[PDB]
């Protein structure tokens, strides 16, 4: 898939905004996440143990790993569909050491996108909501692409 250059103009607008507070919405979306899919916190063995989503909030290490997605993320984006060097080390960890299904993928796009949604409603109207979605779809299938390459296609 390609994008064209007003949708990925309509996804650094809102991503602009999101920068703003990088640390707060990284805190939101992984909260998003582990609270819709509670699977998902397994995986992290830092914080598997919190239970609540106030020990979930109060939890430097959650935090910190919010402004890792993040900001690899948005570095991700910012290249525009150029991606491919900062996908390769991804999705190596993410395929054969963490071992990330694509599934679980398409959790934290759903809450990315409720997220910006929520906090974002004036820079986030349908059709920047359709560009990310998008642009997320396309991070996800150039991401399993190189799953299957590198023998895990999860
Ligand atoms: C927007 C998608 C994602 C981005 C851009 C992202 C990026 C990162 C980055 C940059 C790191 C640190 C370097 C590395 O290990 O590769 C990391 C670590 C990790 N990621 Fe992701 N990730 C994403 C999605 C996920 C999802 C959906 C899960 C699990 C449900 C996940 C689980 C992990 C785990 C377990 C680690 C290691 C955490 C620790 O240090 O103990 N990642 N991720």
Same mark, same amino acid.
Request: glycine letters at 8%; charged letters at 30%.
């Given at each position: 898939?390609?994008?064209?250059?007003?949708?990925?103009? !309509?996804?650094?607008?809102?991503?602009? +905004?999101?920068?703003? @507070?990088?640390?707060? $919405? /990284?805190?939101?979306? =992984?909260?998003? %996440?582990?609270?819709?899919?509670?699977?998902?916190?397994?995986?992290?063995?830092?914080?598997?143990? !919190?239970?609540?989503?106030?020990?979930? +909030?109060?939890?430097? @290490?959650?935090?910190? $790993? /919010?402004?890792?997605? =993040?900001?690899? %993320?948005?570095?991700?984006?910012?290249?525009?569909?150029?991606?491919?060097?900062?996908?390769?080390? !991804?999705?190596?960890?993410?395929?054969? +050491?963490?071992?990330?299904?694509?599934?679980?993928?398409?959790?934290?796009?759903?809450?990315?996108?409720?997220?910006?949604?929520?906090?974002?409603?004036?820079?986030?109207?349908?059709?920047?909501?359709?560009?990310?979605?998008?642009?997320?779809?396309?991070?996800?299938?150039?991401?399993?692409?190189?799953?299957?390459?590198?023998?895990?296609?999860?």
């Amino acid at each position: 898939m390609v994008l064209s250059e007003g949708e990925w103009q !309509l996804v650094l607008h809102v991503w602009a +905004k999101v920068e703003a @507070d990088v640390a707060g $919405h /990284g805190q939101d979306i =992984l909260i998003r %996440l582990f609270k819709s899919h509670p699977e998902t916190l397994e995986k992290f063995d830092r914080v598997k143990h !919190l239970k609540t989503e106030a020990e979930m +909030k109060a939890s430097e @290490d959650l935090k910190k $790993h /919010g402004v890792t997605v =993040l900001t690899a %993320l948005g570095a991700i984006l910012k290249k525009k569909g150029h991606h491919e060097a900062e996908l390769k080390p !991804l999705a190596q960890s993410h395929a054969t +050491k963490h071992k990330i299904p694509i599934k679980y993928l398409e959790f934290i796009s759903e809450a990315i996108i409720h997220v910006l949604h929520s906090r974002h409603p004036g820079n986030f109207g349908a059709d920047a909501q359709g560009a990310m979605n998008k642009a997320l779809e396309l991070f996800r299938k150039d991401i399993a692409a190189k799953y299957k390459e590198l023998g895990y296609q999860g």
